[PDB]
């Protein structure tokens, strides 16, 4: 057996839970209710329950969209807390932790020597004994690691019948005002979701802040005032009047931009000298290369506003080779380096982009680039120790980015019966360019209605202590049937911080069928695959173009910014 269960006695019987605005409003004046939950916490009956987190941060960063806030739950002392553990001391995670049958065996083994009577669940009759419902008849909750990519954080799984017995005064939604990310006027009463992007940005700020309440590292926002003044000081210097008064199209000549670089780098270090011994991390070749990228981005996307120009800057590839601090930063003067490198980044962009009337003068583009660059770096844990990445298999590289599977990518329909199944892949930077970076813009996957149903509640995109919002979408079309997750703030792949994507699906008795003439069509969807995009769209190529078995691929279409990972589906 791979997993085991043992009762623990926690020092604090306090869990947390991230909720949408509607649920946060509900919980302020009602108790938890299975009927009020549209999914009952999980598409899989074995797992239907109330899910909670081991601390406020884990719950905060496992909201994936439409964040409302985080509530604090105090559960009774008489509840038995059963922790799922690996039988191998080296391995803290095992995929059996997620499968109803192995877990069933593990609690049965514990119950037998601990005076708890549980049904005689078998691989045959498992459909008749739903795990969490059955533990709810016995005063049991489950403690479990969040996932293979977050083994040190844990979810507490609370059977609904017990969740419903928690008193109201034990559900805290008020003592910390920062745990409530929205105000009522931010939402539409009919949808009870944010009215507009202004609201979404406001909620995101409170969401981000709470998730790091610092756990996230350097607060890049703390230096916007300095960076803005600094850039403005440069543009008032008479020696830079040629930048200040520049009009017309972009400047992408590498000699020309190098000339600005060597005029700008010393100037920036004068306005905010770095502390003794510390040196600038900006490189000529990367800044020139990156600035050209911003200029190409400004033209192609016709930026009609400051924020549009800032957004476009945040998803330009190669920022890490220009700022030099995407993966590490000199701890002797982190503030000075942040102020120094962003300012350099934005000034170089201001020298290369076209000067578009909607933006303003060249200075305005520079300031817009600074906001964009700062947003990118804000979500990287610079200056904190680098994480050991998860081992991968079957990698595929394109334009310096690498997608690969963590563990097994196969989706088995019966294990031993249908249920919630999942696979995980990582998006990494290829180490040949150790400081390269690229945006994660969207991920997509095949589906089959009634056969392989993506579970939007349990899809996750993970990197560090920040949440990673995305919008889940079931797409139109039958060739193939597909879904996409659109990331909702600048999400950046780095060497030291790859992004982990978990896709969860429900399988059914209809996933695989017998009797078909071709053994490869026995399971739907046929030709299964996922896809990750880290650059601009190619005309007439969307996620459904790539997922299709008819996609030409990166060799025929090297301009693409997609990587496609196939996987296989099997009945048992
Ligand atoms: Ca930060």
Residue numbers in the entry: 6 to 218, 229 to 587
Paper text:
DT homologs from Streptomyces albireticuli (17% identity to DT) and Seinonella peptonophila (20% identity to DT), despite showing no toxicity toward human cells, display significant structural similarities to DT sharing both the overall Y-shaped architecture of DT as well as the individual folds of each domain. Given these structural similarities, and for purposes of clarity and simplicity, we refer to these two DT homologs hereafter as Albireti Toxin (AT) and Peptono Toxin (PT). By striking contrast, we found that AT and PT do not display any measurable toxicity on Vero cells even at µM concentrations.
Experimental phase for the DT-like protein from S. albireticuli was obtained from a 2.7 Å SAD dataset using selenomethionine (SeMet) derivatized protein crystals. In ATR and PTR, the 16 amino acid insertion between β9 and β10 contributes to an ~25 amino acid “lid,” hinging at ATG550 and ATN576 (PTP571 and PTD596), that folds back over and occludes the presumed receptor binding surface. Attempts to unmask a cryptic HBEGF binding site through genetic deletion of the lid in ATR proved unsuccessful, further demonstrating a lack of receptor recognition, and suggesting that the lids are not responsible for the lack of binding to HBEGF. Instead, this region (TH1-4) is stabilized by two salt-bridges between residues in TH1/TH3 and TH2/TH3.
